[PDB]
Amino acid sequence: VQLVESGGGLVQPGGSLRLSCAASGFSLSTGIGVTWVRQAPGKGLEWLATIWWDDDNRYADSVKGRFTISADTSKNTAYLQMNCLTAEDTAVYYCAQSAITVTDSAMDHWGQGTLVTVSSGGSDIQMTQSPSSLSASVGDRVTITCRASQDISSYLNWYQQKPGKAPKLLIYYTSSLHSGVPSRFSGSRSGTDFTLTISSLQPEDFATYYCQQYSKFPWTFGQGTKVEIK
Amino acid sequence: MEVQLVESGGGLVQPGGSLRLSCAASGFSLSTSGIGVTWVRQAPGKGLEWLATIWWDDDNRYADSVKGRFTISADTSKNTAYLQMNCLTAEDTAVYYCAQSAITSVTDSAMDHWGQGTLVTVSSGGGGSDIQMTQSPSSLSASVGDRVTITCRASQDISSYLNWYQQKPGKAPKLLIYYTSSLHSGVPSRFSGSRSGTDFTLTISSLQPEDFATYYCQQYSKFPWTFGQGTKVEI
């Protein structure tokens, strides 16, 4: 018995790809089933779908409505049609034979696998903030920094998000204060480094602060800095 | 009148399913074609992720994470914009916000008037009914000749419907033991399997140099077939 997977490669997110599993040494017509399983890089095994000789088929919730298992017995080959692909679908895809004996149901004669990489990327601008959290007291002055992975001119904004609330724009275009934002807040730039300074910290400043660049699409955000006041 | 964006359409949905969120403007009017309306999401406990913006000259911009799955549109006669979501995955669970970017100058595209957010939960709810297999330890180091015992617990009754697989670095898994204790042909006699209660054991009586690998259990009492997380056996 042998199973051979084909069809993997690079594919765009939201794209589609069809994998094939070609069987030698048995007939898919015959207690026989073919199953797909995947393994994301460095992770464990994830059962995806099984198709039986009687047209019986079963799917994992992670792929139902996106992937379709089928077989063409005239070609002794099973297929995994993978639509709506996501970054989480990057993995080696294996097929395996499941030969009922009812108590004796196992996945056997696994193929060598085929790698599917869901990716478009290295040009996205990464914004990194530091610190990721800080604590200070009423009246204090605190600074939050971000760094762009490439020059973004002055096309950087800062948002404040209080717990349970939507973000509010605080500073735009590096240093312009939004209406309603008092002048104890300020924003500055030195090259790829940007600083939000909060003077005279108040209890209402308890929030997570995010930078965001609009030099290029995709628009990207820093990971946030949580400010606690105690 | 307050200038606000109001969102609706969130809820619980099965993976693979579809939803449509709406973003209705109040106290101001959307500009032509909803230009500048933007969607951003926040997964539970995580940061902000830009998803999509209606931009100039019929250029709808999307993040790689949602392109080809989600679609942004707007009907300005209703002063409402939309994010339609197909092919939903667990990783799409998040609070979804809309906002209106400034549109007059490239000096300022900042997002303002963010909506309250609408929660989208992509879940089959089956975690409860799916059988989780838990292996212990997750990794161990031992010497050639050591006895090695790997355990696997099922979260519910699986009878004796448990298989064990071996996977060596860079290779396909191989079936070692099926139906708790039956050896596949060709499997060395030093491998054996047993059950005590909900605990299933794979024992290697004397570890050999070729036995360094990751071992997985797997139940077939019910679909979905589920695997333990693996136990890596190293030198």
Which residues from B are below 8 Å from A46, CB to CB? 227
Tell me the nearest-neighbour CA distance from A10 into chain B, angstroms: 14
Cα B157 → chain centroid:
26
User: Residue A102 to residues A29, B161, B176: CA-CA distances in angstroms?
Assistant: 18, 10, 18
Contacts of A167 in chain B (CB under 8 A): 40, 48, 97, 99, 111, 114
**Cross-chain residue pair A111–B172, CB shorter than 8 Å:** yes
Strand duo A225-229 + A133-136: pairing: parallel
What is the distance between the alpha carbons of residues A157 and A150, in angstroms, rounded to a whole number?
16
Q: Would strands B94-101 and B111-112 be described as parallel, antiparallel, or unpaired?
A: antiparallel
Subunit contact A111:B225, Cβ cutoff 8 A? no
List C-alpha distances in Å: A19 to A2, A6, A113, B230.
16, 6, 10, 26
Q: In this structure, are strands A207-213 and A156-161 parallel, antiparallel, or unpaired?
A: antiparallel
Put residue B127 in one of left, alpha, beta given phi > 0 → left and psi -120 to 50 → alpha. alpha
Chain A residues inside the 8 Å CB shell of B67: 12-14
Output helix, strand, coil percentages for chain A, rounded to the nearest 5: 5, 50, 45
DSSP lists the bridge partners of residue A95 as: A36
Class of domain B4-122: mainly beta
Closest of A68, A95, A90 to residue A81, by C-alpha: A68
Q: What is the 3-state secondary structure (H, E, C) of B180-200?
A: CCEECCCCCCCEEEEEECCEE
- Locate the DSSP E strands across B1-110: 4-8, 11-13, 19-26, 37-42, 48-55, 59-62, 70-75, 80-85, 94-101
Domain covering A2-118: architecture? Sandwich (2.60)
3-state secondary structure of B91: helix
User: What tokens were used for B189?
Assistant: 């006699």
The owner of tokens 């940007």 is A194
Phi, psi of A144 (to 5 degrees): -125, 130
User: A82-112 b/e with 16+ CB inside 10 Å = b?
Assistant: bbbbbeebbbbbbbbbbbeeeeebbbbbbbe
Q: Other C-beta atoms within 10 Å of B190: how many?
A: 14
Residue B27's CB: how many other CB atoms inside 10 A? Answer: 10
Residue B94, token pair as written in the block: 């998040």
A157 in Cβ contact with A173 (< 8 Å)? yes
Q: Do B90 and A157 touch (CB under 8 A)?
A: no
**Interchain contact, B227 vs A45, CB within 8 Å:** yes
Within 8 A of A12 by CB-CB distance, chain B residues are 67-68
Tell me, rounded to whole angstroms, the distance of Cα A191 from its chain centroid.
30
Taking chain B, what is the end-to-end CA distance rounded to the nearest angstrom?
Answer: 71
Q: Identify whether the C-beta of residue A90 lies closer than 8 Å to the C-beta of residue A40.
A: yes
Question: Least CB-CB distance to B67: which of A14, A121, A159?
Answer: A14
Of B16, B63, B110, Cβ closest to residue A65: B16
Chain B: give the shortest CA distance to residue A216, in Å: 11
CA distance readout (Å), A27 to A32, A155, B127: 8, 62, 35
Three-state DSSP state, B210? helix
For A165, the closest chain B residue by CA position comes to B116
CA B90 to CA A172: how far, in whole Å?
Answer: 33
- Domain ranges (residues) in chain B: 4-122, 133-233
* Chain B positions in Cβ-Cβ contact with residue A112 (cut-off 8 Å): 172
- The DSSP 8-state label assigned to residue A74 in this structure reads G
How far is A153 from A173, CA to CA, in rounded Å?
A: 9
Spatial contact of B62 and B54, defined as CB atoms under 8 Å apart? no
Search chain B and give the residue with CA nearest A120: B64
| Chain length of chain B | 235
Nearest CA to A47 out of A57, A55, A56 is that of A57
Q: Residue B209: helix, strand or coil by DSSP? A: helix
Task: State the count of interchain CB pairs (< 8 A) between A and B.
Answer: 171
* One fold for A2-118 and A127-229: yes
Residues of A in contact with B109 (CB under 8 A): 155, 214, 219
Output the 3-class SS for A126-187: CEEEECCEEEECCCCCEEEEEEECCCCCCCEEEEEECCCCCCEEEEECCCEECCCCCCCEEE
**Top-tier CATH class for A127-229:** mainly beta
- Whether domain B133-233 has CATH 2.60.40.10: the reply is yes
Q: Are strands B118-122 and B94-101 parallel, antiparallel or unpaired?
A: antiparallel
Question: Kind of pairing, strands A114-118 and A10-11?
Answer: parallel
Is A45 close to B216, i.e. CB distance below 8 A? yes
